[PDB]
């Protein structure tokens, strides 16, 4: 089992460390209540700009700094997620070995 799962876990850890997948995946779930500039009372242009800025739409119109911050946050969050996963994985492995050393009839 360990050799079977070592490849996808490495895949997931590398992807979460890189953070680009997390950036292009969790951008539309960002928070806008903190930013007064992202009010967008129309309730429509907010989501299109939220989905469109992370990809290639730089648009240096006094917005980039704001978007930069959000990216950083996601990156930070991304790292944490990856780290957490690794820790949990390790713990699981240990407890699995414990089962292999508790439920095994063999000496």
């Amino acid at each position: 089992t360990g050799r079977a799962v070592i490849a996808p876990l490495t895949w997931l850890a590398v992807t979460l460390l890189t953070g680009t997948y997390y950036e292009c995946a969790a951008s539309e779930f960002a928070s806008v209540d903190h930013y007064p500039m992202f009010d967008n009372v129309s309730a429509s242009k907010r989501e299109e700009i939220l989905a469109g800025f992370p990809c290639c739409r730089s648009a240096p119109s006094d917005v980039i700094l704001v978007r930069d911050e959000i990216a950083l946050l996601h990156r930070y969050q991304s790292q944490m997620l990856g780290w957490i996963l690794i820790t949990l994985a390790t713990i699981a492995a240990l407890v699995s070995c414990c089962v292999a050393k508790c439920c095994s009839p063999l000496t």
Binding site: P36, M37, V41, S61, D62, V63
Partner: protein, 94 residues
């Protein structure tokens, strides 16, 4: 029911000053569409128009004033108002 009307426009040559007033019955200023300035008294200015533009608003008159100094022909465009979209008035510099 809130109506936005742009006032104070016209034609001013290079080196002059212009004042833009919008009546509203967190404001934004735009030109064409290019973002210009926004207010909360906290104020923001675009880099392309930084060092030149000034925006202020007073709650008593429910009007927003934009101060403009040493205008140049490079900013020949119609200015719109945002918060609902204002009518927008054309301003030309020659």
């Amino acid at each position: 029911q809130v109506q936005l009307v742009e006032s104070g426009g016209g034609l001013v040559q290079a080196g002059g000053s212009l004042r833009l007033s919008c009546a509203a019955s967190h404001m934004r200023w735009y030109r064409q569409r290019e973002w210009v300035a926004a207010i909360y008294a906290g104020t923001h200015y675009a880099d392309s128009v930084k060092g030149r533009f000034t925006i202020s608003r007073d709650n008593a008159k429910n009007t927003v004033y934009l101060q403009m100094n040493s205008l140049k022909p490079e900013d020949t465009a119609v200015y719109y108002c945002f918060v609902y979209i204002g009518q927008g008035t054309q301003v030309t510099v020659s």
